[PDB]
């Protein structure tokens, strides 16, 4: 289909590219996938002319990053003269898919100038830098020896090739404004992830997204003390040749917000080959969960397994920013109007959310234990059953089926009827919590009254821990499980770009998001009647938290209602949709940005036609 | 234990091996596998002084010998000569496990020599070869070539190394004569592993091991036309400097037939390694082997199959030299006995010999059809009823167990049974045969009256077909078939060596084997207490023939009555028997006869002390 | 979705139907599935009044018929006397999934009555049957016994009820013509599932599907001596109260031949469970496929495989029927298409038809040898590779992969590479034939040209015999080999009702018919845009030869130009097809049936109102 090379032709001759990062071959945040996923069709394209720029940490160094010499005598000569100046630079290698090569920037090395740079950066722009946050001072370091190392790269070369720099984030926007600030001949792009005071204002202020216009950025930087962060952001945000932003929501904050309109919007990709190793795996999956199930709910199976359907919500544990509420008043309410209806189906929900517990209950394990010696006793009376069955049929009679039996296999049989009594009912939680009073989730869950009981239509189950292949009980990946759910509801109201919603629908899950992401909004505007296709945006912007979370009521209802053959043609539409969302095709508004770049710095010798070209109607 | 370089320190210095045999990089007999295992340990002993004389065929250069340029330029001078002078040789390597270095010979392209070289020949010897033999002609020109190709070696090297000659068969034998003839300064070692006129006087001739001292072995090579074949192998063992033979019997069976006691006796060995890949193996054959008889024997299984012994014989199609005719009627003798004493153990005796057939019988077919239907009608009911017991144990139920059968449960039951349904006897051959009048096995099976019949303690199986692992009812080879028997019995008359009871031996079974053949007198010579170890050896030699039957049936008595535990440890002594078989001990006799025709042939420089130093008392 | 219980609420109170068929518990042509799928359906419909009427064979009755006590007295006495009487009549169940209850009748222990039976026979309808048919005296005796049976039964009974009769086949049609004749108070329905004379005039005259309006049925008839057998078909078509057939082509014939237009059309369906036991099981069946051509192809693989496309047609060895000259053709005329287009995909074409051929050819046999240990040494050298790299990994250094391969291992890379040379060109047939000069399929290949050339982008693949499980080659059974395979091809000229495409289809592969089968037409008339869905008609009614091989031509290119998402698309759809083929809708048409055979015999008592009402638009 739509590849890199399509009709971006275009004479790149002597450039080279730095992909200025704080969090290179250093694992912090999520837009290291990001970048790791995007370097192997940035390199190809660029060749041996891409660098990435970050700090030096001694465990990625030696976990993912080998050491090696640079290849031209250019950077020879100017790491020589960066060590012997009084600084600590290196070379080398990532180790990751694409192999890209890396300078590292040690910003330990580098405290005796500080005193000197915060000076420089005050008469340059009036940027003042107090000393109790130990984070700013790095990035401050982290941009004066970006911007150092590029002048002495541009100084030191016999000719002077086009550079061209790219920053990603405000730990790195101090390197933009202070090549700007030099004139040095560079292209600068800076794309932003996240609004700083987007996080800070979501939380306690209210209707945030209902007051933009309202909303005089200086005072709310300034009551926080994070006034000279934003104004770190907001100077590097005006002096940049290109401004870009991940999401469309986001574009609209910054406009706000950074006061700046984005050029561009680049949104967040991922490689499909690996996700893609399609019915067989899913109902492995199902199939194991239903095992899961059938131990969680030892003695009260009192529903059909072949009417249930498997909701499930992960990330971290934001109970409003996620909308879990939300989720739990509109399961209540779809537990409500099933039981009214006397309905078969049942919702069974999972909550992967992080959380601080210390052991399993001793409910969980016991009921592991019992279906494990419940599914070893079947084993081996069947097998028994089977070996009788084949030496009585040999020799051509019918069985006697009443004497297949002995007064081991009933004892064993017997042994496992009392092991299945219980008089209780099944946990809401797999875990013991340590702040059981102050948690939202079970509050909430006791507010509106789902204790698993066997009138109730609806299960909850909640995951506090990482799920992983060697859990006592869930010994299973993150991948795995999701393969095998029915449905992801991501209710989210704060969200620059929605990776675990992403990972679900180029899974081929059908989920439900909101018109309040970046992935919401990406996949209304690229596809046309999105519901045909298994995704559901809820409209969160231009209603109510009710209206919202009844029209997340009525799209679960809808979801319940479906049928079998229903169910299977809408999977088959979200699973041929994994494509839209590849660095194969979400790589060309990068590589639009970039030439943007070009053409405003260097108007003589580039110049570009503003093709805004790039679509899946309907099929039904 | 016992290594090559345990006591044989000796100078060896620039001295070369020749390895001169007809079938080397030829498959045509059965010491292909021994001159292929023993070239292994030869070479590692020889460095690169180990060469390989034979014929050339282009079958053999095209699938198993890589043509290469020989390391020496002595090689190429007298490789470029031999081609020069009018003949065709070609070098390489032979592509089996030690590698070691080859020169072949084409025999068809020096036929124009022919007449020249009979005639010297006669003069030289006063040897004749008739005209119509198509294979003396091809013998004495190989012979002729190889003693060429020895003395222009040995003329056209610049320093004289000690060149050895090592002939194998009479086919090789003119080779040795002529550089006997010739006063080369080489090393002449003739081996034997089967005298010619042993073959031809056993079929025939009555009483052919009472009467070695009253054969005048002149009249029986001449009345056969195979005089002038005898002449020259025995002409060659005479003007032998060390003569050797593979086995005792054959030891003096030259003694007195060739008229020469041989110096040393070399039995054949094999790699131990590859068959060693020690009871699950021989657990799941049984297993398999008894869902073949369980197949084969539909609708009259009305013995217990756990107190089964099964017994096998195989080698070629020889009655007579193999004593297939001792087996059946020890084995009907045994089963009078049994119907006698009122036992419960059952005897199934398998015959692997080749055969003229052409396709299978309709029975075996219909039979293991039949039992494939039922094994998966009793592993789809066995399915159903452990999914029905799982589901309802899981409520905390006990089985009612006259519930769990429905209708197309009883129906796919009563299908199996009426197809169970048979009114005549398991017939006693799965194929057809083309001389069925004429078969001297089914004829003698007919006069010792076993048809498989309900009251037969004994059953028969006779499987003329290779047994391959693409065969319609038996998918199994050779080596995983024997692994799961329980006894070998091989009650042969003539066979100089027993390849197959070494494989069986080796392989861990016990075994029944006779005075009468190499490895029983191998056997017998180097343990003591040989019933102990799970060999039973037949007197066959001092006895006659109903002498013989009687002891073969006392033996299978005794094994059929022998408890579990007493076979459990008769096996793992004859698992602790396979290393008196490997040629890690077994070269070291060819070693000795290598030094001995070092000693003969140059007395100044070698001179070797006669150390026959060479071991197993008991277990119990 | 829509099952019998739908509309058709009828007051069905004391009513019984026979469903005669000369075929039931005896297998002997292809409406026996067709029976056996609509006995469980129809029963569940009917209760116990299901009966099925037809001859007795010793083979059906031991392998699938359970002989059983009639449950009512009625039965009792009317067995009774028909037993006493002369005859011979037995009572049981049928062993199949519904297990209906069947009466069998001895035809041959009524040859007394045939004489006075004939002459009756002419006395009422002036039908005469030479002696020397041996299948319609058959037929006469069974109509006779069938027509007393039910005279005895409805004049026995203490109370009268209402007896449906159903016959299927002109073999049956003596029996609904002579209860017509005595006024027996009984519901008669005749169902056709092909002409008599289609198949006769199909093969010698020409243009028989443009001159049906031409035939004078009579003389056809006549010269053939099957003049008879017309005249009991037609005359048993005529008396009927109502005539079916299974399909629309059928439909017109039987109104040009038999004078009488069809009532009701009733196509053939089969349970879709079985079948459905989905892309895991195609990738399996696929990859298979893929080891198999490289088994065949050696030393010729210089194609990619990842671009190659499997076509088969399968079927009796009909070579005008299903129109194996035109596939021929047209696979020639892609070959010759794609070889000027210069692409890179490649065709392997399967022709499953079976043949008179003795075994295996030396060719395959080799190849599949070959293919065998080129695997066994690859896993060989892989296994070793791998520990010595997990070994030399464990002390952390790189692999010095120089070093990895030693000398046996490239000894037995150089064995395989030696084994994997060959001069010639794969064969084009399996199997050696026995009319190799005769046989049409490989004169017509010879003709056209495809011997698989190197520059041939066409690969022809013929296997005549049955496809087993069992197979030296293909171990495979015909379900698991069809689902792997891309697409069916089936230029069928004359067969009333396609079982081999409809297999194909519900199987969920895409199928290419004509509007010349029962098949075709069904799918043309129920579906809107069929190649939407994967199935494509060649128009073969209203075009000459040259034009129908035209459109199947630029049918199979297009289908080669298709992309990957494309194929993934139409496999999805004709996947979500298999519901239309099933008896729980197809079983409709025959309901409605018998509902009109009552209201025409019984309109006192039932009414029917005629609706006719019975799908998929479009998808994209
Ligand atoms: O999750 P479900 O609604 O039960 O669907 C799961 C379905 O199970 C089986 O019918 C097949 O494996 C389908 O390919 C799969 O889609
Ligand atoms: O524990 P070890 O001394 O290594 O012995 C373990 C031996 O390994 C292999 O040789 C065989 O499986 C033996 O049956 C087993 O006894
Ligand atoms: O036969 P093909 O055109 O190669 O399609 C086969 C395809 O292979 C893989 O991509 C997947 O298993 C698909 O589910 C399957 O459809």
């Known amino acids: 289909p739509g590849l890199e090379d399509w009709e971006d032709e275009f004479d790149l001759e002597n450039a080279v590219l730095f992909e200025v990062a704080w969090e290179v071959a250093n694992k912090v945040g999520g837009i290291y996938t990001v970048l790791q996923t995007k370097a192997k069709v940035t390199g190809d394209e660029w060749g041996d002319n891409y660098f990435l720029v970050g700090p030096y940490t001694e465990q990625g160094v030696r976990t993912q990053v080998e050491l090696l010499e640079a290849p031209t005598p250019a950077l020879k000569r100017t790491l020589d003269s960066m060590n012997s100046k009084g600084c600590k630079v290196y070379f080398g290698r990532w180790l990751i898919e694409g192999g890209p090569l890396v300078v590292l920037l040690d910003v330990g090395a580098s405290a005796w ?99 933009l216009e309202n909303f005089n950025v200086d005072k709310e930087a300034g009551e926080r003390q994070i006034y000279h962060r934003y104004c770190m952001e907001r100077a590097a945000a005006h002096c940049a040749h290109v401004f870009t932003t991940v999401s469309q929501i986001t574009a609209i904050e910054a406009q706000h917000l950074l006061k700046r309109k984005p050029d561009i919007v680049t949104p967040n990709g991922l490689n499909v080959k690996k996700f893609s190793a399609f019915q067989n795996l899913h109902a492995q999956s199902k199939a194991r969960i239903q095992e899961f199930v059938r131990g969680h709910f030892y003695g009260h199976l009192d529903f059909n397994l072949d009417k249930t359907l498997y909701f499930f919500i992960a990330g971290r544990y934001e109970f409003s920013n996620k909308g879990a509420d939300v989720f739990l008043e509109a399961l209540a309410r779809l537990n409500y109007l099933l039981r009214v209806n006397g309905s078969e189906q049942t919702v069974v929900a999972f909550f992967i959310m992080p959380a601080r517990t210390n052991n399993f209950n001793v409910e969980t394990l016991k009921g592991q234990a019992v279906r494990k010696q419940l599914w070893d006793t079947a084993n081996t009376v069947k097998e ?36 299945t009594q219980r008089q209780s009912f099944p946990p809401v939680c797999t875990h013991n919590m340590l702040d059981d009073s102050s948690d939202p989730i079970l509050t909430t869950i006791r507010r509106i009254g789902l204790f698993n009981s066997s009138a109730d239509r609806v299960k909850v189950i909640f995951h506090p821990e990482f799920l992983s292949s060697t859990s006592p009980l869930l010994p299973v990946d993150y991948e795995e499980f999701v393969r095998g759910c029915h449905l992801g509801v991501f209710p989210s109201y704060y969200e620059p770009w929605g990776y675990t919603p992403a990972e679900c629908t180029v899974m081929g899950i059908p989920s439900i998001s909101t018109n309040l992401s970046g992935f919401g909004c990406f996949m209304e505007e690229h596809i046309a009647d999105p519901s045909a296709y298994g995704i559901y945006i809820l409209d969160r912007r231009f209603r109510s938290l009710d209206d919202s979370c009844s029209q997340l009521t009525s799209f679960l209802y809808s979801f319940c209602q479906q049928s079998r053959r229903q169910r299977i043609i809408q999977r088959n539409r979200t699973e041929r949709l994994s494509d839209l969302l590849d660095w194969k095709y979400l790589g060309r508004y990068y590589m639009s940005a970039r030439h943007m770049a070009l053409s405003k710095a260097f108007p003589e010798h580039f110049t570009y036609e503003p093709n805004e070209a790039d679509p899946r109607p309907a099929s039904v």
């Open 113 to 211: 100038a500080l005193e000197r740079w915060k000076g420089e950066l005050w008469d340059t722009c009036n940027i003042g830098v107090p000393w109790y946050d130990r984070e700013a001072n790095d990035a401050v370091l982290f941009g004066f020896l970006t911007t150092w190392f590029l002048g002495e790269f541009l100084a030191q070369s016999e000719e002077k090739p086009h550079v061209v720099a790219h920053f990603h984030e405000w730990l790195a926007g101090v390197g933009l404004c202070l090549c700007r600030a030099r004139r040095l001949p560079v292209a600068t792009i800076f794309t932003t992830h996240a609004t700083l005071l987007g996080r800070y204002l979501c939380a306690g202020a209210v209707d945030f997204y209902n007051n």
């Open 384 to 419: 028994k059953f089977g070996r009788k069955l084949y030496e009585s049929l040999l020799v051509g009679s019918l069985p006697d089926m009443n004497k297949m039996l002995d007064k081991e296999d009933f004892t064993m049989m017997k042994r496992a009827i009392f092991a």
